[PDB]
């Protein structure tokens, strides 16, 4: 085995490879949304910017797991990245709602990964999950929830409220 | 008695202790409103900021009365701070209207305290009330009244007007 | 329920509301001590400064729990803040000893809150408690213990030692 | 159709969507190589850096095609991104040789895309391909060829030459 | 007992004293290696620098445990520091391999200390171990593993590769 | 023998190895004292700082002998470092008195080492001892003697004098 490996269970190694693919997938979803909002018949530049940043961040999140895998002595196994569920995302509200659901799905996976790490007595992995993923995930979920409420207040259907709220994200 | 006490009536000393508690209570009310507007299902960051500042200022107002008590030779007696009347404050308009009523209630108490001080021929206390409390209270009441009128103009019910007016407070 | 809530148990939500009240209470205790030491017949400006800072910090600690509540989707419930146990705090030594006991009481509550969070498998809450509260609480307790020992060395009864030690806190 | 579309053939629109997927795939290949060279039993930090930059650039290349699609009035269709052909890439020489082949494969696709655009008399698309893709592709191929020759000179098998050549890329 | 002690088990107190001695011992091992590589018949200034820094860091690690002991109310008990196992360390490769084994030995001890702290429900101690020791230990082990692989690539036996690799550490 | 060795007697080589261990031991003694004075029931931060600096300096003194050994062609032999004679050091006065005795013990050893070097006609070693050790040792002894006298004047028993004198060292 790896000269560096120590207290690193095969199940955590495999779950990290699954989380890598999921982070890359979420990055791909947000990339799809980003350029959907730059279509000439959508033209929501604030939403496009918001989702392009989230796409970059999720790709960074994937790479932090890849560095982590190598650091512990695991071996990165990269799978296929699925096409995004949608090709068109509707209104800003509907995209935010899809993002909220995705973020909560990633959070569930991460909490399961923490349970795996905790069950195998790997405090180094639980620390990584708490400090670098679980904290960020809760803040992201709270932020998206705030945005949904703000957009529902401003007027969530294709109108002046959506146009004004989009400026808040620019 | 206190080596410093001079022309300081027991009734003014007691009324100051009552005003201290009332300032601390108003600070607590505004703190409740501040974090109500940061709930994910309210998301009014301008109102939250406005009330968090008012909460800090009312706590400062309480401390200025505590310094004053010590300066005159009175003795600070701290009571229980009551829970805020509400736990949820409705719309921005309703919170402003509750704040307006509270400010006018504090003003009434302060004017009564001035009458107590004037009745006991304490010009040092009347000066404190006029220069540090009564001036600020009238400006606060005028400001909140302005805000209520502006929010009623922009559209006071949970809609685009409330969302736009909230930006004026950010 | 809240669009953001996830893996957030009702018991942790309720314990956070209890800790909020306790942080606000400790803030109130330290505020009482702060202005006790500014009485003209006490005149310990270093102790007053030390306790006024601790009062501000405990109010900040309360607000961090209020932000946390909102972040997780819980609902803040604010109760009555009890009057401080004492209105007069004796010598500097006696105030420090009362502060030490209060800090250890808050620490016990926080460790219980960690046990609640751990029992409900909430690593996000255990992380908050470890990184933002338990670390600060142990440092505060060690610091107060140091101060008590230093004041006992300098001369803890109302004399030159207390006067000189007070300058160390200015 | 799109209010902006003009002289934009359905075949060019479809070929752009195919090139987007291929750019994303090459980005994924280079990402795999990048973290392969950070394995503790490979430890080639110069190669890792070189491939991580190429991974970022190919993702940028994909996005430029996505902006282009939207600019012309086409509609972005995102497919599945295939897993990289390899999970382990051997020596630096073998990775460079795999990169050279991939770059020449992308170049072939781009030249075919130019033939499609030229056959449909779309000078705007031929200009994009010449100015933004074909130029970069030839420079990349020449650079990788230079590197292969340099590494073959320094000593391409796992030895001092590979270790010294890796420093040239750091 | 100590006026500050709270939730601090005698077994954790004793294990900290054992870890202090082990950190001081590792510091001593690295000090031996550092000046071995400055012998006139070894003359590997990069290795000497690398091990002198690790010697300083392990002594700092020991002191952080000594501060921690005092912070929790435990009592520092200092034992004998054993002579390093070797007086001469061979080649750079052999010293790195000895360092790797020592680092993994310290890591095992620290993970056991975490299990002790976790078994006694001391989250403050588990936090210290995760944030200040376990993170650093894994990075150190990964770094040494990288170095071993790099030196095996450059040529690990007393030759040009060892001479060139030594410059990477200067 | 060493290609560099010249006029370097085996007895001086062995005495240097003995002095190395003694410098490391004194460093360990001062480290013990340093963190004794940071105990919550001692709280003498000036003494702690003074002894932590002396601990660092004695470790530097050990390293200068290790560099010297290598410079002359001798071979460093590292022994066991004994536990400090005490685990608790009493008052500041008692620690200073223990330090004074230790410094005079090291001085005696160094003067014996000078006699060894002089007896073997090694002027290079006598120069090192005079310029780098004997000068520093006499200044240290004079300084500690000054401090003892100053602390005896201020009031050496656990009281205001010890508390005030401790500030002189901060
Ligand atoms: Fe993520
Ligand atoms: Fe007020
Ligand atoms: Fe607190
Ligand atoms: Fe490309
Ligand atoms: Fe260490
Ligand atoms: Fe010395
Ligand atoms: Ni709609
Ligand atoms: Ni309404
Ligand atoms: Ni007393
Ligand atoms: Ni080969
Ligand atoms: Ni060999
Ligand atoms: Ni004594």
From TrEMBL, chains A, B, C, D, E, F:
UniProt binding sites for Zn(2+): 131
EC number(s) reported in the record: 1.16.3.1
Substrates-to-products reaction catalysed: 4 Fe(2+) + O2 + 4 H(+) = 4 Fe(3+) + 2 H2O
InterPro entries listed in its UniProt record: Ferritin, Ferritin-like, Ferritin-like_diiron, Ferritin-like_SF, Ferritin_DPS_dom
Catalytic EC class: oxidoreductase
Binding positions for Fe(3+) 4 per the UniProt entry: 23, 58, 136
Annotated GO biological process: intracellular iron ion homeostasis; iron ion transport
Entry annotated with the keyword Cell membrane: no
Binding site for Fe cation: 23, 58, 61, 103, 137
Highest taxon of source: Eukaryota
Residues that, per the record, bind Fe(3+) 2: 23, 58, 61
Protein family membership: Belongs to the ferritin family.
Protein name: Ferritin
Species for this entry: Penaeus japonicus
């Amino acid at each position: 085995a790896s000269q560096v490996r120590q207290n690193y269970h095969e199940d955590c190694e495999a779950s990290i490879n699954k989380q890598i693919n999921m982070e890359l997938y979420a990055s791909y979803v947000y990339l799809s949304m980003a350029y959907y909002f730059e279509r000439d018949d959508v033209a929501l530049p604030g939403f496009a910017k918001f989702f392009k940043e989230s796409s970059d961040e999720e790709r960074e999140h994937a790479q932090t797991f890849m560095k982590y895998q190598n650091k512990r002595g695991g071996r990165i196994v990269l799978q296929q990245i699925a096409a995004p569920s949608m090709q068109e995302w509707g209104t800003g509200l509907e995209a935010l709602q899809a993002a909220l659901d995705l973020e909560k799905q990633v959070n569930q996976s991460l909490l399961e990964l923490h349970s795996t790490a905790s069950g195998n007595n790997d405090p180094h992995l639980t620390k990584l999950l708490e400090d670098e993923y679980l904290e960020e995930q809760v803040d992201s979920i709270k932020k998206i929830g705030d945005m949904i409420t703000k957009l529902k207040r401003a007027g969530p259907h294709h109108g002046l409220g959506e146009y004004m709220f989009d400026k808040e994200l620019n």
